[PDB]
Structure 1
Amino acid sequence: ALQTIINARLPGEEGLWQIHLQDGKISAIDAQSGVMPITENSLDAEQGLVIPPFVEPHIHLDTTQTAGQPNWNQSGTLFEGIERWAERKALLTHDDVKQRAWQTLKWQIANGIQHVRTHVDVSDATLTALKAMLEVKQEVAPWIDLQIVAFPQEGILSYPNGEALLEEALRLGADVVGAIPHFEFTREYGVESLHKTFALAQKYDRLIDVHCDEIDDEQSRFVETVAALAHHEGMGARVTASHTTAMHSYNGAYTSRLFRLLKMSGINFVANPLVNIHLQGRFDTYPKRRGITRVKEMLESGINVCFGHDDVFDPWYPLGTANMLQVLHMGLHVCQLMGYGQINDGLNLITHHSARTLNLQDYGIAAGNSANLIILPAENGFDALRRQVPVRYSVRGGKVIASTQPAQTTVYLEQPEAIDYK
């Protein structure tokens, strides 16, 4: 067994620390007088940083790893992604889905991610991918806690039987209800689709997560309905609005009006930098807008926002290794969160704020919580973000589920020298 972690730094804390493990929980965290000797049963942090595991609050595991089949997203738009997907969605099998989802899931474990929320397209009479993904959830449970969103990719009112299909998906056991109002045929459909979604969530006691205004249209304002419904139902914390990239193009007077409500409703926001930068601004020429939602202003106002990866190697996004520090990296740049303080706090955007978004209770390095945690070979958030460090150890329920032996770089000058980039 493991009974202690030694020589660990904690975010915003002086010196080193020792973390006591008992029965898959954290029993105690005590300061150190300094470096301790490596004992058996203890895991050596080696003065690395200890934080709770990375969260991925937005990913599509049913589409993952399918890039270039049958065809490519030539235009690289959010709308042609959906055309390409519908072609490939016709060739989905139970085995195919599980095979691909497991691959990405493995990368995620390797990268210190122990919590994941995956959207699954339920605009399909057969519900192949949703049913397969409900199994993957149970299969992967020992390493990752997977939440499944029933995601009506082709609309609730705009797809034949979409409302029925969404409901069946909840009956079967999807944890979260999704919607996509800006894709519905009309504005009125969009608005009503959100009443339905909310009624479903209340009927089944489930969370909500909308693809909300993912479009460079300053008239796409469905987020206000999401926030208003949540507030009316008192269900704030259970509600997430994903993307809201339209907000990047709102006029400032409306945005300021809107923010009052967003703060009162207590809903959550996910931005997806890697994908947003790639797919937004595609209808601009020059100049060309960035297209990420208003992260910086949300942080200032204390509105919970976090970062997802959204797509790993599929029609919508041809790259990725499910790496959250890489996502955070693109986010700080594009959102211009480049002060020292801002970059160092950036970890919260892939840890604590994401956990708040998934509505987790058992989360954080504190006594009484499960021994779920990761160790980074780095001094602080800034250092880890700057050097794009891998995850040294991933500990789940008191057991090491993954470990990375760091790369080693040598330059041969007048004599050999180790390079660490510090």
Structure 2
Amino acid sequence: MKIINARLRRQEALFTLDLQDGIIHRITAQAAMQTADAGAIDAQGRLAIPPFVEPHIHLDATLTAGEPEWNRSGTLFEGITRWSQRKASITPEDTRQRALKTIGMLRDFGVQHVRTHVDVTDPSLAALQALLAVKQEAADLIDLQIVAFPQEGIESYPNGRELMTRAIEMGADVVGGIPHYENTRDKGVSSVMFLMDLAQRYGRLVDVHCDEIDDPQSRFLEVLAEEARVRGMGAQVTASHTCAMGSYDNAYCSKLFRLLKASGINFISCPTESIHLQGRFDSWPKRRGVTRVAELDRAGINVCFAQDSIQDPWYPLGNGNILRILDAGLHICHMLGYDDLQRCLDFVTDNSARALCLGDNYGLAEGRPANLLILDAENDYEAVRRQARVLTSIRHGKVILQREVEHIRYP
């Protein structure tokens, strides 16, 4: 299958992409726009990109908002309370059905790579079982990573450490955590040592809900970063949220950046989720509550954006479209400069793939998997400004989604 007349990011001319046997066989510069071909994917001057990535979402909780009651306060903590209520009735079939619907939404919006957290503070591990199976079942749509996430804490939820260990044994490929939710600071710290030991022993990736709170003394990030540095695991480690960094003392934060850079770890920020859940304990002025995304990027550190929630105990909206999240992030993090906008798709493609350690299984280069999208825009700026639609999604060299180009009529 050929893709003709395509633009490639931050370049100017058109290219033909020749896909053969599931991989990218050839990429070739065109003299010019070429004759409209119905046998080919004719991008008609539109951008070809590798698939969007959703590096942080909760598929076990998705589509449960309001059951049995609503998060009336809009806080992280009542959200956990409400989720505990809903978790009481969870089963693998319930998990599989809701997860597949939401995977459908992600698919509709060009997402082919997904990292889901799953609560393993549940003696039955029902959702984990379901999502381990969904990874295989949904493989024709997405590559799913699964994070063992101890929602109610490692150190104070009953048999917390044993559930984490069992979850990893069962096949979760990423180790999670929630140090700011442990009952005491010292247990926050011990939880990090435990989970890094667990990850290192099994050669697992790491993705921790880290300092998701507006308390400037929530400093578990330094503990995770240092463990990553000492153990040489930085490329395999991700700190999600780090909302508290958005409130840190600036002298401390400047010092911290040296360790952050040296550790080599990745950062994920969930701007729609945080704008909603953070700032709730201020009156006025009311803080944004989002981590220092622009500053991390400028320091040469890998950072990216995620939706986090789709219609769940924490967040009432959501439709699968990562571009909306990109829009929110660039606004809230003050990244609307000319230069930011010309490369802003990094934060939902390349950077996210890096955090997921996708390697040569991602990107538009010869010999790599034939997974790509045709986007209805010529560049990053227009992609975000217009919230460009995904016209074609190709996976393993096969078209799995096609959208007609919109045309408005003016009678």
TM tier relative to shorter chain: over 0.9
Question: What is the Cα deviation at residue 50 of structure 1?
Answer: 0.7
C-alpha distance in 2 between matches for 1:407 and 1:123: 46
Q: Which amino acid aligns with 1:237?
A: A
Question: What is the Cα deviation at residue 410 of structure 1?
Answer: 2.9
Q: Which amino acid aligns with 2:152?
A: E
Name 1:397's counterpart in structure 2. Answer: 396
Structure 1 residue aligned with 2:44, among 39, 43, 46?
A: 46
Quick check: 1:66–1:315 contact (8 Å CA) kept in 2?
Answer: yes
C-alpha distance in 2 between matches for 1:189 and 1:161: 14
C-alpha distance in 1 between matches for 2:71 and 2:404: 37
Q: Verify: 1:187 aligned to 2:185, yes or no.
A: yes
Question: What is the Cα deviation at residue 127 of structure 1?
Answer: 0.3
Pairwise mapping of residues 316-331 of structure 1 onto structure 2 (< 5 A)? 316-331=314-329
C-alpha distance in 2 between matches for 1:59 and 1:290: 21
C-alpha distance in 2 between matches for 1:182 and 1:235: 22
C-alpha distance in 2 between matches for 1:68 and 1:153: 19
Quick check: 1:56–1:309 contact (8 Å CA) kept in 2?
Answer: yes
Q: Which amino acid aligns with 1:309?
A: Q
Question: What is the Cα deviation at residue 40 of structure 1?
Answer: 5.2
C-alpha distance in 1 between matches for 2:156 and 2:37: 62
Quick check: 2:10–2:343 contact (8 Å CA) kept in 1?
Answer: no
Pairwise mapping of residues 139-158 of structure 1 onto structure 2 (< 5 A)? 139-158=137-156
Name 2:366's counterpart in structure 1. Answer: 367
Name 2:231's counterpart in structure 1. Answer: 233
Structure 2 residue aligned with 1:220, among 218, 221, 227?
A: 218
Q: Which amino acid aligns with 1:385?
A: V
* TM-score of the superposed pair, with normalisation by structure 1: 0.96
Pairwise mapping of residues 2-401 of structure 1 onto structure 2 (< 5 A)? 2=1, 4-39=2-37, 41-361=39-359, 362-401=361-400
Q: Which amino acid aligns with 1:230?
A: A
C-alpha distance in 2 between matches for 1:379 and 1:355: 22
Quick check: 1:11–1:380 contact (8 Å CA) kept in 2?
Answer: yes
Which SS does the other structure have where 1:9 is aligned? Answer: strand
Question: What is the Cα deviation at residue 18 of structure 1?
Answer: 0.7
C-alpha distance in 2 between matches for 1:18 and 1:10: 10
Quick check: 2:10–2:342 contact (8 Å CA) kept in 1?
Answer: no
Which SS does the other structure have where 1:179 is aligned? Answer: coil
Question: Deviations for 1:1-27, whole angstroms, at most 9, x for unmatched residues?
Answer: x2x100001111121111111211112
Name 2:406's counterpart in structure 1. Answer: 407
Name 1:420's counterpart in structure 2. Answer: none
Question: Deviations for 1:55-94, whole angstroms, at most 9, x for unmatched residues?
Answer: 0000000000111110000001000000000000001121
C-alpha distance in 2 between matches for 1:247 and 1:404: 40
Which SS does the other structure have where 1:214 is aligned? Answer: coil
Name 1:419's counterpart in structure 2. Answer: none
Q: Which amino acid aligns with 1:284?
A: D
Question: What is the Cα deviation at residue 37 of structure 1?
Answer: 1.6
C-alpha distance in 2 between matches for 1:195 and 1:405: 51
Cα RMSD for the two superposed structures: 0.9
Question: Deviations for 1:163-217, whole angstroms, at most 9, x for unmatched residues?
Answer: 0001000110001000100000111101011111011111111100100000000
Quick check: 2:16–2:29 contact (8 Å CA) kept in 1?
Answer: yes
Quick check: 1:213–1:246 contact (8 Å CA) kept in 2?
Answer: yes
Quick check: 2:62–2:311 contact (8 Å CA) kept in 1?
Answer: yes
Q: Which amino acid aligns with 2:282?
A: D
Q: Which amino acid aligns with 2:213?
A: I
Question: Deviations for 1:329-349, whole angstroms, at most 9, x for unmatched residues?
Answer: 000111111112212211000
Structure 2 residue ranges without an equivalent (≥5): none
Task: After superposing the two structures, state which structure 1 stretch, 339-348 or 191-200, moved more.
Answer: 339-348
C-alpha distance in 2 between matches for 1:195 and 1:384: 42
Q: Which amino acid aligns with 1:112?
A: G
* TM-score of the superposed pair, with normalisation by structure 2: 0.98
Structure 1 residue ranges without an equivalent (≥5): 417-422
Question: What is the Cα deviation at residue 142 of structure 1?
Answer: 1.7
Question: Deviations for 1:380-415, whole angstroms, at most 9, x for unmatched residues?
Answer: 01101001121010011111111112333233xxxx
C-alpha distance in 2 between matches for 1:202 and 1:12: 38
Question: Deviations for 1:255-303, whole angstroms, at most 9, x for unmatched residues?
Answer: 1100000100000000000100001000001110001100010111010
C-alpha distance in 2 between matches for 1:79 and 1:390: 35
